[PDB]
Amino acid sequence: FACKTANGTAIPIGGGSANVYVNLAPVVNVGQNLVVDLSTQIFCHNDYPETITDYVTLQRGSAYGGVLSNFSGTVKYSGSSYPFPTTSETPRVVYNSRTDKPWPVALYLTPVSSAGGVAIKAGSLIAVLILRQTNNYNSDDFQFVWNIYANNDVVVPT
Ligand SMILES: OC[C@H]1O[C@H](C/C=C/c2ccc3ncccc3c2)[C@@H](O)[C@@H](O)[C@@H]1O
């Protein structure tokens, strides 16, 4: 079981860390949502599906930088909503193909009422998401750490 981004950045068997750069929407007004859709960007396969089934959760997600300072939000995992920052581990997604499948994670962020001007600086860390991978085979308990970076600024006008 290994993951790669669209960019090419990989985390191999046994897990690891990666830096992921997302284009964000340049402008977001108060009570509009900012979406960080990582299901278009992070992908994962099972390396031996014939006899092994991989089980993947969002263990932990935390907010940094502009998102920590001037956005409240939720995370969507596999079609359900959870608080962000995350208060618990989610239900598991099954991976049983050698073909890449999205990691089904998106953030729904909305500016707090304080927020104005540049509220996310380009190049800044905005989140760290921990994919936890297990299987029906042995004790493997691997962390795939995704460190999410803004490619661009985000302005909250008013
Ligand atoms: O995705 C399945 C597994 O992939 C690797 C270990 C791989 C096992 C294996 C075992 C016997 C094999 N026999 C013939 C050819 C290949 C073989 C591969 C880890 O990421 C693990 O955490 C994950 O569950």
Residue numbers in the entry: 1 to 158
Study authors write:
Among these, the adhesion of UPECs to the host uroepithelial tissues is due to the E. coli type 1 pili, called FimH, which mediate their attachment in a mannose-dependent interaction. FimH adhesin of type 1 fimbriae promotes intestinal colonization by binding to colonic crypts of epithelial cells, facilitating E. coli adhesion and invasion to the urinary epithelium, a key player in UPEC pathogenicity. Importantly, the mannose-specific adhesin FimH has an essential hydrophobic binding pocket of non-polar amino acids that surrounds the aglycon portion of α-D-mannopyranoside glycomimetics. Preventing bacterial FimH adhesion to highly mannosylated glycoprotein uroplakin Ia from bladder cells represents an appealing strategy to control UTIs.
The crystal structure of the FimH lectin-binding domain co-crystallized with inhibitor 11 was obtained at a resolution of 3 Å. Delightfully, the co-crystal structure of compound 11 and E. coli C43 (DE3) FimH also revealed the expected 4C1 chair conformation of the ligand 11 bound into the active site of the tyrosine gate. In the mannose-binding site of FimH, we observed Tyr48 in parallel, while the Tyr137 residue was in T-aromatic stacking with the quinoline group of ligand 11. Four FimH lectin domains were observed in the asymmetric unit of the crystal and the mannose-binding site of each FimH lectin domain was in proximity with a symmetry-related neighbor in the crystal packing. The two binding sites of FimH molecules were held together by the two quinoline substituents crossed over in a parallel stacking, while their mannosides projected into the binding pocket of FimH. Therefore, the binding of FimH to compound 11 appeared to simulate the bivalent binding of the natural oligomannosidic N-glycan structures. Inhibitor 11 interacted via different amino acids that included Ile 13, Phe 1, Asp 47, Gln 133, Asp 54, Asn 135, Asp 140, Phe 142 in the open conformation of FimH. Interestingly, the inter-molecular π-π stacking of two quinolines residues of 11 triggered the interlacing of two FimH lectins, providing a “bidentate’’ complex. Interestingly, among the mannosides studied, the quinoline analog 11, having an IC50 of 3.17 nM, was the most efficient at reducing FimH-mediated bacterial adherence. Although compound 20 had a higher inhibitory potency (IC50 0.82 ± 0.4) against isolated FimH lectin binding domain, ligand 11 (IC50 3.17 ± 2.3) showed better potency in inhibiting bacterial adhesion to bladder HTB-9 cell monolayers without adverse side effects.
